[PDB]
Hints:
This is part of a larger assembly, with one copy of chain A and three copies of chain B. Helices cover about 15% and strands about 35% of the residues of chain A. Chain A is an alpha+beta fold. In chain A, strands 1, 2, 3, 4, 5 and 6 form a six-stranded antiparallel sheet that branches. Chain B is elongated and about 55 Å long. The chains are: A alpha+beta, B mainly beta. The interface between B and D is large, with 45 and 95 residues. Strand 1 of chain B pairs antiparallel with strand 51 (about 770-775) of chain D. Chain D: Belongs to the ryanodine receptor (TC 1.A.3.1) family. RYR1 subfamily. Chain D: This is Ryanodine receptor 1. Chain D: It is found in: Sarcoplasmic reticulum membrane.
Amino acid sequence: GVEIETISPGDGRTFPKKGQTCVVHYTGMLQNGKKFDSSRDRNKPFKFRIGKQEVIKGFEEGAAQMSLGQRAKLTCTPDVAYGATGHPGVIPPNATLIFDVELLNLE
Amino acid sequence: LLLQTNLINYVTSIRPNIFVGRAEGSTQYGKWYFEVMVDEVVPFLTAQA
Amino acid sequence: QTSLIVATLKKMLPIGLNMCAPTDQDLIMLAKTRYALKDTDEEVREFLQNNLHLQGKVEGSPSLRWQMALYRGLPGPEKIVRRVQEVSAVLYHLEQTE
Amino acid sequence: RPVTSPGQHLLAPEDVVSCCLDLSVPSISFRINGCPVQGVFEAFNLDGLFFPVVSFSAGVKVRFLLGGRHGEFKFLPPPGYAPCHEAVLPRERLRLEPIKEYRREGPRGPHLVGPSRCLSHTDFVPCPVDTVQIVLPPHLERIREKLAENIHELWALTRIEQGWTYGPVRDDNKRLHPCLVNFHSLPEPERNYNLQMSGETLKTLLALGCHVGMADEKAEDNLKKTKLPKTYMMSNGYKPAPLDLSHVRLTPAQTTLVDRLAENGHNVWARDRVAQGWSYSAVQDIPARRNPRLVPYRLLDEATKRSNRDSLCQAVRTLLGYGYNIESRWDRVRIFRAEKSYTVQSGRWYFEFEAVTTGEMRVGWARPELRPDVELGADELAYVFNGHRGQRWHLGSEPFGRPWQSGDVVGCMIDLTENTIIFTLNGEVLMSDSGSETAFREIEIGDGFLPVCSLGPGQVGHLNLGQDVSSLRFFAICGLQEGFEPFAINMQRPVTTWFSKSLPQFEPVPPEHPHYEVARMDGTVDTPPCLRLAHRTWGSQNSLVEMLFLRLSLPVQFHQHFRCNRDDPEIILNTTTYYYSVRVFAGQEPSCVWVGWVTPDYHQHDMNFDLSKVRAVTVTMGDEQGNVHSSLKCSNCYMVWGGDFVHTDLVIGCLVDLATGLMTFTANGKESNTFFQVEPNTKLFPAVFVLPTHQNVIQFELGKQKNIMPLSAAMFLSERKNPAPQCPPRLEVQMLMPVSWSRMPNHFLQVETRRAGERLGWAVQCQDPLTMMALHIPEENRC
């Protein structure tokens, strides 16, 4: 239950595979356009590995369908990101998240 | 409630000096056309697109 | 009433002021004070002949700095005391008739 | 709003875009790489002129393509659409420019720029005096004939000088013309046309109010004809012989009459061609009915204005020889001043102001609390000198000094030891008429002073506070030896400046307004809380009457997504409908009141407000086959006119459902057919526009209805479940002000523009990035 929209095309031939690590630059914001996180502010790409439950389900499912070099937008429902608890002081309960993810390199 | 802050980019606009309109008794034509061609863009020159 | 003499003196004054450099400012007050009392002209001349060292130091205020920038870049010892006495006499006399 | 297209993606290098505008039915459509886009912009306002535009940030490079000698299209236009380069006016040259800037670079420093005059869409429709009225003066019929005869002789002479000769069939290449004959030998229809034209010169003189009558009965038999050599003889024996009018001299009124007769004649011809269907173009196209000079006379080339003007000057001289004698306010000024922190309260200071134009400008010293919407010097808060015509302004005007010239520089000096202000021009102290050498005297230190200047439309100026002493051009001549110092001496960074921005905004109504009063009334057992407005100078000799725009200070927000006497507790606790009403007291005309809502992006402030002036637009989406499946209406003002429900008081109610985006209205408890619809995430403010006509005008009411919550339950999170009406202190009325102060940035983007070539067109470029730290106000949605 995740909506994906394309912004820029990718190679279309390389996709994430089991045992690889994804390096991405992302920007997060609420459904009302209020930004709450951005990896580009810290000028440091974020690294995560598939299958080890290091990030929310929405992010992993969104990234699994992206090709190398592709820029796309992801939408996650409250039941898939944080549910009725949220992140204290950052995200309120029952919030829909929108992400701007770009895949840089795979390893 | 509290005031928010951030960093944003500057933006500007450019136009050519041609003007067209619609009115009773006007001497102007009613249909127009033009094109734009893009050469270079840097998707992320700073933290903002 | 306003006479022609004072008017022309005011007109001619700026060049007279431009004749002497700002560094000599303090000696002008000193001469004015000495003119407060009836210090004979030659008496003042000889007096300042010895106190020349009291002139304003280049080390000093911000104000002297940018002013000197300008005084140097114009197209161009006892003469100094002569100039100071000449300017101070007329300055004091003009002030006495404010 | 998302749109669908093949290979949908953001603009990338090698992409080409094309835009089409159709004004017959307002519509705008796009294509990318030749692929049609699935969206159109239709039904929009047409109160001005349109122009192409591009917006960008640092790090782009684009080219404009306009056809013709400029950029060549990569795709042929659709049928009936013209290239944009054909719209250039005769007197103008194509170029690329910014939009309504207030600053530009200069040879020695930045220049300040005042407002700019702009054309209006009503300037392209001619306005001849031509009325149905006919003169047909029997006393001017003879001179009509003689005038036509001499006009023919002059015309023939002009042709023959240019190598034309007689032939029975016109031939432009061989320059043969059949009209090179005696006037009386022309075909009757040509003679009649000439007589008609002569008569219409005479009738147009009369329509312009000229008195035309015989004065010298001897003049005609003293006229002589010009005797041309035989080289002016045609093969049919015709040689022109125009009158020798060398002795005739137009009076000033007659010269003016010629200048008026030609402009009207051109405008009548222009409107005749417009009625015939011709339009303006940069290239002539007879089959397309496009002509290069199909514009009103105000905007024409001097070469043709002078040409057509001479045929009417010669005509008037002939007639004289024949003996008959004949005989918005806020966008009009812009103010610049220094920041308050640089206020001065002692010493002696100096700065310069150079005038690049000889128009309306002012400069001087001002107090920190200066207003932005009052012309400088009309109050006690400024001391300025107007250089357009020698004057000095403080609580009025008085003659002073002399008018300046382009390139002149003015020096302003203030001395707080004697409390005097002195002005100089090109190093020469300006002198008062009464022999005073100081513009102002006996001023008081008060809070301090700041440098200030203002610029009128079309003006340009250069301001120099003197950070670099060498930059000053007349400081040495006057001021250096008097002990004055540059204003900005010993500063690490350039001085900051503020300017007056003419963008209307909402602000609270001051408690001490001299004309308006707002009173808070507490609720009772029978009435709810209210906020009523009163006019406190109605009927006096100096009352103020004008349009008034009001809104409350807190919005209501719709839900993020839509679905699909006693009160029942469950119904009210589960409802999502809120209510509020307005009462207009007797004596206030309901025809001058509008009630409804408004979005946070309303900035009109119109002095002749009608519902027809509200901005609106429709956006439609479809499929490849063209089947429409969604149409949306967008606006910024949702109101209903009070005249639709037309003594006694009148009450209007408004309803909203935050879960479905629907709005409805009721008058005196009776529903209305008007309704609106909005989108999930919008904000709305209650609003009321009124033109007062009584001491008691309007009254907001915050009550409720059966099974309907009051809007204080939607405005405040705490009261989300409390059906008791309230009105906390944070809720108050605000009015719309037309001008405000603003801060000028310290750095600006650098943009390069040039003509790449015949085939490539014009280019724009920007590489160096800039950024700033913003502050956002959540409730008003602005930064």
